[PDB]
Design a protein around this motif. Structure first.
Motif, short mmCIF file in Angstrom:
data_model
loop_
_atom_site.label_atom_id
_atom_site.label_comp_id
_atom_site.label_asym_id
_atom_site.label_seq_id
_atom_site.Cartn_x
_atom_site.Cartn_y
_atom_site.Cartn_z
N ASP A 81 0.81 -1.21 0.00
CA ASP A 81 0.00 0.00 0.00
C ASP A 81 0.85 1.26 0.00
O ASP A 81 0.65 2.16 0.83
CB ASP A 81 -0.97 0.01 1.19
N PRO A 96 1.98 4.48 -2.62
CA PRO A 96 1.52 5.17 -3.83
C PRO A 96 1.86 4.56 -5.19
O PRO A 96 0.99 4.48 -6.07
CB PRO A 96 2.08 6.59 -3.67
N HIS A 139 -8.40 -2.62 2.81
CA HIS A 139 -7.13 -2.04 3.23
C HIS A 139 -6.57 -2.89 4.37
O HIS A 139 -7.20 -3.04 5.41
CB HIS A 139 -7.33 -0.60 3.69
N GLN A 151 -2.80 -3.34 0.08
CA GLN A 151 -4.11 -3.02 -0.45
C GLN A 151 -4.58 -4.24 -1.24
O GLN A 151 -3.87 -4.70 -2.13
CB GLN A 151 -4.01 -1.78 -1.34
N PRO A 201 0.69 9.14 -7.78
CA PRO A 201 1.49 9.37 -6.57
C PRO A 201 1.83 10.84 -6.41
O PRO A 201 1.99 11.55 -7.40
CB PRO A 201 2.74 8.49 -6.78
N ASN A 216 -3.25 7.97 -3.85
CA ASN A 216 -3.59 6.57 -4.06
C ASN A 216 -4.77 6.40 -4.99
O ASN A 216 -5.67 7.25 -5.02
CB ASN A 216 -3.92 5.88 -2.74
#
Lengths: 205, 205, 205, 205
Positions: C144, C146, C169, C174, D157, D160
């Motif tokens: 998780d 970016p 989550h 993720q 980024p 998310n």
């Protein structure tokens, strides 16, 4: 003239826990309109088709669900007005007219032997007064002294008297509706007033 | 004894296009049970509370929607059986008993003047036969020859006869139910049989 | 993804004085289940088939008489929750789920242009997520951070991604539900984990 | 995303011989709208509140008497469409939309473990697509070549991506509805097109 002679014997009965909607269908399929209610072998109440139909325990189903479960006990009438089988027919008519009712459970003391209705009482009066015997219907005014009716009656022979009713008590006079039949009935009106009686009117029985 | 004297005057009427459910409520709030139907100022049909209730035009709403729009015209009875206002009371009773009905529109020819029911006819018979006058109810068997009733009647004075009915024609005998009132009515049973008449039974008027 | 693209245009409407039982039949014969209520050319209320059926204004006819006369105005809901035609499809789903409703009048400001229901929103999600496109449904856990999703996505070619959802989550991760289609889709699971991705499970689109 | 995660557990069930009107009241008082039907410990049918209400087995009482005795068996639907507890959430939505249904019994093979409805499926899509997470809803057109989505994703980024849907396949282009959240989400639209991506529109999550 007894209740016995005009009642319907062995009527349909129902129990207090009979569902209202079952009672209704029972009255439809057997041609009756009131339903005496038996419990413990005794008469504990009475229900008419009206009572059942007008029953009020909401949406359409809360209502529908409520009727579905309503029992005869919750809508039956008491105490029930009854007549004894051996009572004079006229007692039934009196009870029916006094209390607005169209039907009457017939009893022998505590036991139930039948049911007598307004149309049964009608039939009875129709029979005993001879309303179907033809002849002549004569309204006649006779003096209102004790001996007058005996004196008026001598004019009828060779014809017969089947029934006399008092249409009215009047000043000086009793007004009779009289039905006469048989031999030379046509001669009666003549004989009556020729005998000095006061003949108000005459039509066919 | 006329229909006039016992009818209820100025009854509620309804029109053929009156909705069934409106007719019902009208009968509830005015205390009646049958509803003559007027159109063009003439009587065109008749409806009872039963007729309206048992109306059958499905789910609960198809049915409900159907009752909501059903009109009196679709359930009314014809031709309507009626009696003339000036007719003898007994004619109404005859019509009611013959045809199972409890009520009868009262007419003057083509016009509507009132309504007479089974309980009205009951009241009438109760009045003219004196069922409320007390005295004595006497069943007596007299020979069934023309002159016998005149002869039986001489025993009653000083008391009065108010009504005579024929309970039964029997071999050799006519069985009368007789109501007598007034002075020394208690003496009548004595006098009757002491005069050789056959006294079957005696109870209070 | 707009409400426009999934709504049913030109729905049936009704007026406040429309009788409840007429509204019901209208919904039966045209296949709908809710009925926006127009007055003065504006939206003044909303009724469902349930609202109409469960209406509560007694005997069977007092009730029946009452339903017969109950109007839409007495049972309609307000204020009415609506969506703009040009709103994103997802807004409708949000409104429907928040407020327990299955249907939603569609507006252009004050004007009414259509109606969108739960099954319309279902169709939309079924289309835009490709639930009918076959291929492979891949649950995959990516870090998780970016940049991770971009990196995971490079494994899919020559195949295509049609939709990605976040199943959960998780600590460090993720969890994606991903639908992929097209050339060599069968190769995707290999490529993903061979590229060091964490492939949770795989079944047919 | 499983049916398990969104179903209501331990639903109310009913038996075939359950009276229709009892089933209705049960649905009222427990807040449900469909009623799976158990017999012999197996699922033998399914009934909705509509099915029960629209039941059609006449006067008002013949009808009323008939509803009173109608049983669930006579109106239940079969065969029942079901989903396995362990099935992907999306399968339920597919079944519901295909067959017009709003509810679905949830099974483990032959056993019944719960019930999943349209609003449950709505909740699920609302969760996994992040329709309540705010951020930005971005419609973007990327070339429809295999590698394009990976390339578009590098612009997001430090923010998310939570979900991507395909609004439309277009000539030369795949139109994505994308929800992005977190750090500097406001910067995403810039980065996307500055990276040469074709940004159709942008509104709040």
């Amino acid at each position: 003239m007894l209740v016995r002679d005009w009642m319907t014997k062995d009527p349909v009965v129902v129990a207090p826990d009979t569902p209202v909607l079952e009672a209704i269908r029972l009255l439809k399929e057997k041609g009756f309109r009131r339903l005496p209610v038996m419990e413990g072998g005794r008469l504990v109440g009475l229900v008419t088709d009206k009572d059942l139909k007008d029953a009020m325990p909401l949406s359409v189903w809360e209502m529908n669900y409520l009727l579905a479960k309503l029992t005869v006990r919750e809508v039956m009438a008491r105490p029930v007005v009854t007549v004894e089988a051996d009572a004079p027919l006229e007692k039934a008519a009196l009870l029916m007219e006094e209390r607005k009712i169209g039907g009457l459970p017939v009893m022998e003391g505590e036991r139930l032997v039948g049911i007598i209705t307004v149309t049964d009482v009608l039939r009875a009066f129709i029979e005993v007064l001879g309303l179907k015997l033809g002849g002549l219907r004569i309204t006649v005014d006779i003096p209102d002294v004790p001996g007058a009716l005996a004196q008026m009656a001598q004019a009828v022979p060779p014809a017969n008297i089947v029934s006399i009713a008092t249409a009215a008590h009047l000043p000086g006079y009793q007004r009779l509706v009289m039905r006469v039949v048989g031999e030379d009935v046509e001669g009666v009106p003549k004989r009556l007033e020729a005998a000095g009686e006061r003949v108000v009117d005459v039509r066919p029985g």
